[PDB]
Design a protein around this motif. Structure first.
Motif, mmCIF file in Angstrom:
data_model
loop_
_atom_site.group_PDB
_atom_site.id
_atom_site.type_symbol
_atom_site.label_atom_id
_atom_site.label_comp_id
_atom_site.label_asym_id
_atom_site.label_seq_id
_atom_site.Cartn_x
_atom_site.Cartn_y
_atom_site.Cartn_z
ATOM 1 N N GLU A 138 0.819 -1.211 0.000
ATOM 2 C CA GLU A 138 0.000 0.000 0.000
ATOM 3 C C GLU A 138 0.855 1.264 0.000
ATOM 4 O O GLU A 138 0.486 2.252 -0.653
ATOM 5 C CB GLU A 138 -0.949 0.021 1.198
ATOM 6 N N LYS A 139 1.999 1.246 0.702
ATOM 7 C CA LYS A 139 2.906 2.394 0.665
ATOM 8 C C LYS A 139 3.471 2.618 -0.736
ATOM 9 O O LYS A 139 3.559 3.766 -1.200
ATOM 10 C CB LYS A 139 4.042 2.217 1.672
ATOM 11 N N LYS A 140 3.833 1.530 -1.433
ATOM 12 C CA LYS A 140 4.344 1.664 -2.799
ATOM 13 C C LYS A 140 3.283 2.210 -3.755
ATOM 14 O O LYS A 140 3.584 3.054 -4.614
ATOM 15 C CB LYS A 140 4.870 0.322 -3.304
ATOM 16 N N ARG A 141 2.031 1.765 -3.602
ATOM 17 C CA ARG A 141 0.967 2.265 -4.474
ATOM 18 C C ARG A 141 0.643 3.735 -4.208
ATOM 19 O O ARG A 141 0.374 4.495 -5.156
ATOM 20 C CB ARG A 141 -0.277 1.393 -4.319
ATOM 21 N N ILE A 142 0.700 4.157 -2.937
ATOM 22 C CA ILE A 142 0.493 5.564 -2.598
ATOM 23 C C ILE A 142 1.594 6.436 -3.200
ATOM 24 O O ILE A 142 1.316 7.509 -3.766
ATOM 25 C CB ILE A 142 0.392 5.722 -1.068
ATOM 26 N N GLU A 143 2.851 5.972 -3.130
ATOM 27 C CA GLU A 143 3.949 6.732 -3.730
ATOM 28 C C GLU A 143 3.835 6.808 -5.250
ATOM 29 O O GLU A 143 4.183 7.840 -5.840
ATOM 30 C CB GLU A 143 5.298 6.126 -3.342
#
Lengths: 116, 251, 275, 42, 51, 222, 48, 203, 97, 49, 67
Positions: free
Chosen positions: J1-6
């Motif tokens: 989820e952190k990678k998709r937000i970035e």
């Protein structure tokens, strides 16, 4: 200016920057704008951007005089006076919230900043 | 007002060594117009106003043919001056009412014969086709320098297909135009099929306005029964383009 | 070399030391008139907007100030040792100070030059990094690299050469090869002959991996055949010092044939060759 | 033809001497110290 | 092998996989032919059998 | 309000499409020159010619490599001098093809197009000593390989892709990596077989056997 | 302005609309008669 | 009984609660505004408050202006440089107090330009009648989801001109406030180091 | 390369595979910055010699210092005066006008 | 989820950079229109004869 | 028989749905609604050829129920 529009000579960038620096009020500079529009004078594109930037700066100090005329009599600024500090004029050719609108046009990559 | 202080030493090699801006402007003018293919330079000349003219103000045809490109007489008379109406026309698709994308503010002091020779009736076939292109570019562009929107690309492909079909009607023995029409119809199908998924309202408006309802139809039943017609929605990256809250109730 | 001629001159070095101490203990005042108020910078027998219009540096303009008197004293001292008081002259005095210790004195002269209009060139940063290169302090050299990067000066091959010598003097030998690899890859800088000399000097004492000697052989062959450089005395010395460490007879034969090619190519033998 | 080349002849002589049962002539070691001039990389 | 066979992929080379099959075929499936390390336990039963 | 969906990598990266009607026109040089026009010389500090990262967290963890990178806000993009060369099937195939054709012609630099699986293979070849160096390695389009020569002939003898047709790709098991490490009954650290794991890291077969993983096989070179 | 296009003449290919076929881009499984190995059968071949 | 003693004794327990990064609903911005107007009412001592404007009526300029909320105003995908949260005029000093965003691609857009700060200072010179010789404007960057000890110390040093001991006399709980910056954010620490170490921009 | 690193399976030959990186860059830094790994005592000295003479030398790092370093306890209450100030500020007005 | 937000935040930053470069291209096309206006006006001057 | 086929269980459906058995959940496109309460759904699966080392997508049509 009707003579300058007939002879067909271009007004330089330093000429119009010194021309609108001698204007004190905002109503005086619109007289110079609609005279040279009526007389069909020629100039550069940097001369047009430096002219409309002077029209932007003359309205800014015109409203700053108005918001201090109400400040000296009331003793405290209003929310509309403090909003003029941050925002300023919204409809402007070269506004301060996007400081990249003078890089392609001007050869110095910087807006002319006049002081009094 | 004050006199300058004294300079006490000096070397000539200090004087031995705006030009980044002058290099970047000619690199931008090269990447915009000069570094293109001729089929892109023609459409750049059609769209933008002064992409041919460099900062030297001398064309590539002018530098080799100066007696044909330059003006023969130099008149000291009626100087038009600076254009204060230039904000209305940033691109040539904004002024198609006259020839050579000349605005109506430029035609003030001339007689009626010059204004009649630059009217809509004197336009060429390419200028009329560009006026038809600009009529839809006024309707479907996002910004004034936008030419690659899908609603714009679909109507451009459809106008090109109409031009090629009208040429094939009067001359059915042109074999190149057959292949170009067969390619342009497939590209029009691709543009309309992606326009159907990315913006359905403009697609439905284009379908309704021009009386082409069955322009997106499967050619063959044998391939349609195996789901190969709708698999184009998956393989092109368009399967979840529709916002479900704006058309249906997704509960 | 002008730096060796300056550093052998004891009186000029003492004059540069006392001028640097006067600049370090109390900086002058970039001021208008009545600059004769102090005994630190006596006179020797509108400036900023004058310097901004006509492309003249601030040190080259005398407005009867303490900074102008300090600049006159510095140019008086630097002309006694043979220099010129320019961007090319101050690198020599910062190098001659930095090779004899004197880090803060050379830094004070550097900052006084950079404040007085003579810009911080990459060679002035190289003459600054010579102090940490001779001392062997890696962190000061990397801080000077980041400082010249922060001031908008892209480092040339001299800065990476002094960084390589800093990692060599601190006994970190594969770091020289890493700097050469990143200088070819990222900095897009073609190596000079001094790069090959420092790389062979680092490979001569490299114990990080087992393949230091075949890497040095292939690097010498790549310098001679592919790069087209002709090997001088430092290339031959750095190669023969590495070939003299292995007691294999083929490497000893390579060292003997290299010494014979050295004496055949018009490079006479010295104490290092016999050593 | 590139199969008759001074670099190829030097490599052939080197792998011939490297067996230990062939004796190198003087031009092999004298060409290891003075290699033939190449036309490439210029 | 399909019905009643624990083989999940070919032994050496395979067509290109994506997602969890890409992580499974290359890293995470069983392999008893490995001479160095046995097929690993789930966490935290691998930390105490590291030696 | 309804907003238009960004479709494709060109609209998601925000292409200007300055050229009329052409969506596949190259855009790196014009955008690089406009970004060079965007920066300013501030006086009471400019940028250097070293490569740049868009975020401070994107700096390399090596402190020596961090000296060659700096932090540029939006000027870190569109870096590079070379473009993608033309005149095959997959970038591994032409990456092997151009090096195999330029090692026979005895050239110094080969301009190969940089992808994720290409520059990692080149880095593994540089680690094993088959490549002397690189030029413009931070370019996201194409980079130059400085080849290594020793005594007249090239270091790289045979360089082949895994997709020999250019179409069919392969997935190597760790059993395949252990086969590639011990091939023809010897121990093979000579011929370097390179794969890309599920974590998108490009490793040779030795580090693949060392941590008991496999991947998609890219190319072999010796 | 007007679009007088008819999809019947587009689908049924009136006016002789000719689409050039791709060159040997079938990629069918029944025509293939060779075993596919990684790196091919003979990976590194030198013409001498 | 314990939370009753916490409620009775700690009159600013909501401010310490939001400043430590515990409030996930609305953040610490309203607590920051209440903290700043509390610290202004104990230094100016004659304070009027109308809506989003707090003013001292001494003739000397002690003005706190809540301009806007920088989270909702920063629309993603727009080109507008400079959106601030608070504007504080203390005598001759001007401070643009900005709470940073969670988007690292918006932190470069949140800080105003030098030309924009000069325009804000010139607007202050126009409206307040203050001479442009002594006018200083400085940006201030705050952590997005919390508020560490060093940011509150720099806030009391810059915008209220308070040292450590008189701020500990005014605020009792500041001495035991031990929040620091998280090591997982390198971009914010680099941007706040490059922002807070800048000199006052003089018009 | 060395030829025996190309045919033989010994583990330090894995160091011949990777490129040359600096030994201050691979090893973690110290208090001053980049540091050689053999310049810190605990890396070069083996663990069986760190018992008799090692703590005899490094007694001064823990048990030597100033009078306020050696005679001041650090495990006392560090928030008593804030609590006293808050109690006396809550109790003294005792009213809401 | 952190990678998709970035990834989503990177897309938004690309859109903002697109808007800035579109403004620069607007000014460049304005000066090219000025050149075209000078040339077309001096051509219509001799068309008037 | 030769050339040898086999079902390839690694596809989009195995990546999305955790299935209790093979063919339990499927994802496809509606191609025919000429019958009442019956949607014809075209779905795809993969069959693997180990000789040519490639997987090919075949299509199966199903009748589903929509009330």
């Amino acid at each position: 200016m009707h003579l300058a529009g007939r002879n067909g000579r271009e007004l330089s960038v330093r000429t119009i920057q010194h021309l609108f620096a001698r204007t004190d009020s905002f109503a005086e500079a619109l007289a110079v704008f609609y005279t040279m529009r009526r007389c069909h004078v020629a100039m550069n594109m940097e001369a047009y951007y430096s002219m409309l930037y002077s029209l932007q700066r003359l309205e800014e100090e015109g409203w700053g005089q108005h918001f201090r005329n109400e400040y000296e009599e009331n003793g405290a600024p209003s929310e509309q006076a403090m909003d003029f500090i941050v925002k300023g004029i919204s409809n402007a050719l070269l506004p301060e919230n996007k400081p990249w609108l003078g890089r392609v046009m001007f050869q110095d990559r910087n807006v002319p900043d006049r002081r009094y | 007002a004050m006199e300058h202080p004294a300079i006490w030493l000096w070397y000539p090699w200090r004087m031995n060594p705006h030009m980044p801006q002058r290099r970047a402007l000619k690199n931008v003018h090269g990447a915009v117009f000069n570094d293109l293919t001729p089929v892109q330079k023609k459409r750049q000349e059609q769209m933008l106003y002064g992409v041919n003219i460099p900062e030297t103000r001398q064309m590539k045809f002018e530098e080799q043919h100066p007696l044909l490109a330059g003006a023969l007489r130099k008149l000291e008379g009626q100087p038009k001056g600076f254009p204060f109406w230039y904000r209305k026309y940033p691109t040539r698709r904004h002024a198609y009412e006259y020839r050579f994308s000349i605005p109506v503010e430029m035609l003030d002091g001339y007689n009626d014969d010059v204004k009649k020779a630059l009217s809509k009736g004197m336009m060429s076939i390419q200028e009329k086709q560009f006026a038809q292109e600009a009529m839809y570019m006024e309707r479907y562009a996002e910004h004034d320098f936008d030419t690659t929107s899908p609603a714009v690309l679909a109507v451009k492909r459809a106008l090109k297909c109409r031009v090629l079909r009208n040429h094939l009607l009067t001359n059915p023995h042109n074999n190149i135009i057959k292949t170009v029409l067969a390619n342009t119809e497939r590209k029009l199908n691709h543009a309309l099929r992606r326009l159907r998924k990315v913006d359905f309202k403009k697609y439905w408006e284009i379908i309704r306005d021009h009386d082409v309802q069955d322009i997106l139809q499967p050619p063959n039943l044998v391939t349609y029964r195996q789901g190969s017609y709708w698999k184009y929605d998956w393989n092109a990256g368009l399967a979840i383009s529709t916002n479900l809250a704006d058309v249906m109730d997704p509960r | 070399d002008i730096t060796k001629s300056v550093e052998r001159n004891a009186s000029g070095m003492q004059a540069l030391l006392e001028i640097g101490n006067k600049l370090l203990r109390s900086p002058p005042s970039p001021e208008p008139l009545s600059g004769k108020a102090s005994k630190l910078y006596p006179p020797v027998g509108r400036a900023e907007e004058l310097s901004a219009k006509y492309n003249v540096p601030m040190a080259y303009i005398d407005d009867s100030s303490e900074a102008s008197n300090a600049s006159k004293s510095l140019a008086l001292v630097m002309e006694d040792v043979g220099l010129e008081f320019t961007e090319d002259g101050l690198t020599v005095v910062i190098s001659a100070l930095s090779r004899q210790g004197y880090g803060t004195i050379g830094r004070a002269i550097f900052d006084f030059a950079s404040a007085m209009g003579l810009g911080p060139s990459a060679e002035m940063y190289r003459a600054l990094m010579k102090y940490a290169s001779r001392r062997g302090d890696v962190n000061e050299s990397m801080a000077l690299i980041e400082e010249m990067k922060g001031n908008g000066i892209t480092p040339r091959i001299g800065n990476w050469h002094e960084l390589m010598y800093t990692f060599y003097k601190a006994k970190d030998y594969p770091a020289v090869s890493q700097i050469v690899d990143n200088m070819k890859m990222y900095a897009n800088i073609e190596p000079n002959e001094v790069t090959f000399v420092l790389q062979l000097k680092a490979l001569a004492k490299d114990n990080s991996q087992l393949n230091s000697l075949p890497e040095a052989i292939q690097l010498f062959d790549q310098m001679e055949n592919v790069y087209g450089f002709i090997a001088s005395r430092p290339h031959y010395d750095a190669m023969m010092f590495h070939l003299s460490q292995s007691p294999r007879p083929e490497m000893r034969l390579r060292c003997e044939e290299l010494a014979h090619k050295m004496e055949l190519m018009g490079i006479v033998w010295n104490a290092n060759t016999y050593l | 033809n590139e199969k008759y080349e001074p670099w190829e002849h030097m490599k052939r002589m080197g792998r011939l001497v490297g067996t230990g049962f062939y004796i190198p002539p003087e031009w092999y070691n004298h060409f290891r110290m003075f290699p033939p001039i190449n036309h490439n990389f210029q | 092998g399909g019905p009643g066979s624990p083989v999940r992929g070919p032994g050496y080379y395979a067509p290109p996989m994506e997602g969890e099959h890409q992580r499974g075929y290359t890293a995470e499936w069983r392999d008893l032919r490995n001479p160095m390390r046995p097929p690993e336990f789930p966490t935290p039963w691998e930390r105490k059998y590291r030696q | 309000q309804g907003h238009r969906l960004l479709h494709g990598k060109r609209e998601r990266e925000g292409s200007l499409f300055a050229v009329a009607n052409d969506v596949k026109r190259d855009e790196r040089l014009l955008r690089q020159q406009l970004n060079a026009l965007l920066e300013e010389e501030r006086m009471p500090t400019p940028l250097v010619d070293l490569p740049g990262v868009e975020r401070r967290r994107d700096l390399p963890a090596d402190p020596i490599t961090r000296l060659f990178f700096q932090h540029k806000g939006d000027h870190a993009l569109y870096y590079g001098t070379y473009d993608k060369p033309s005149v095959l099937y997959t970038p591994i195939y032409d990456f092997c093809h151009r090096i195999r054709e330029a090692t026979e012609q005895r050239k110094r630099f080969v301009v190969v197009p940089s992808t994720i699986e290409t520059r990692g293979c080149a880095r593994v070849m540089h680690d094993h000593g088959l490549v002397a160096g690189f030029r413009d390695f931070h370019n996201d389009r194409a980079f130059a390989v400085e080849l290594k020569y020793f005594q007249g002939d090239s270091t790289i003898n045979v360089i082949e892709p895994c997709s020999y047709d250019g179409r069919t790709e392969f997935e190597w098991s760790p059993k395949m990596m252990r086969r590639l490490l011990n091939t023809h009954g010897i121990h093979n650290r000579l011929v370097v077989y390179i794969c890309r794991t599920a974590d998108n890291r490009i490793i040779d077969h030795i580090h693949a056997v060392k941590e008991n993983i496999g991947g998609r096989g890219l190319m072999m070179v010796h | 302005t007007e679009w007088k296009l008819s999809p019947r003449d587009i689908v049924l290919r009136r006016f002789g609309q000719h689409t050039k076929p791709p060159g040997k881009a079938a990629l069918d499984v029944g025509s293939m008669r060779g075993s596919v190995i990684p790196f091919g059968r003979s990976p590194g071949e030198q013409l001498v | 009984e314990l939370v009753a003693h916490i409620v009775r004794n700690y009159s600013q327990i909501d401010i310490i609660y939001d400043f430590l990064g515990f409030n996930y609903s609305e953040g610490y911005r309203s607590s920051l505004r209440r903290y700043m107007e509390y610290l202004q009412c104990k230094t100016a001592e004659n304070v009027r408050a109308s809506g989003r404007l707090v003013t001292g009526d001494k003739g000397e300029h002690n003005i706190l202006f809540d301009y806007c909320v920088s989270r909702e105003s920063l629309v993603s995908g727009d080109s507008c440089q400079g959106i601030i949260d608070f504007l504080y005029i203390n005598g001759n000093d001007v401070t643009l107090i900005i709470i940073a965003s969670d988007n690292p691609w918006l932190r470069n857009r949140q800080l105003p330009h030098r030309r924009q700060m000069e325009g804000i200072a010139r607007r202050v010179c126009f409206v307040l009648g203050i001479p442009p010789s002594e006018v200083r404007i400085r940006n201030l960057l705050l952590p997005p989801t919390y508020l560490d000890k060093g940011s509150i110390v720099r806030l009391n040093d810059i915008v209220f001109r308070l040292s450590n001991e008189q701020s500990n006399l005014l605020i009792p709980w500041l001495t035991n406030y031990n929040k620091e910056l998280d090591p997982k954010d390198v971009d914010y620490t680099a941007l706040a180091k490059t922002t807070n170490e800048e000199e006052w921009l003089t018009l | 390369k060395v030829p025996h690193s190309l045919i033989y399976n010994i583990y330090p030959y894995l160091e011949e595979i990777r490129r040359r990186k600096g030994m201050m860059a691979m090893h973690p830094p110290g208090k001053d910055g980049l540091l050689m790994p053999d310049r810190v005592v605990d890396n070069r000295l083996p663990d069986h010699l760190k018992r008799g003479y090692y703590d005899d030398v490094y007694w001064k790092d823990f048990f030597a210092g100033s009078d306020e370093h050696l005679n001041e306890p650090r495990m006392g209450l560090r928030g008593d005066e804030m609590r006293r100030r808050l109690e006396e500020a809550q109790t003294s007005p005792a009213p809401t006008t | 989820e952190k990678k998709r937000i970035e990834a989503r935040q990177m897309m938004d930053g690309r859109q903002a950079l697109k808007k800035k470069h579109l403004d620069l291209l607007r000014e460049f096309h304005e000066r090219q229109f000025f050149f075209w206006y000078e040339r077309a006006s001096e051509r219509l001057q001799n068309m008037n004869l | 028989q030769r050339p040898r086929r086999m079902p390839w269980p690694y596809d989009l459906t195995s990546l999305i749905f955790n299935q209790p058995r093979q063919g339990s959940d499927k994802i496809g496109y509606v191609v025919g609604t000429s019958m009442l309460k019956t949607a014809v759904v075209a779905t795809n699966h993969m069959v693997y050829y180990p000789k040519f080392n490639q997987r090919v997508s075949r299509t199966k049509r199903f009748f589903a129920h929509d009330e």
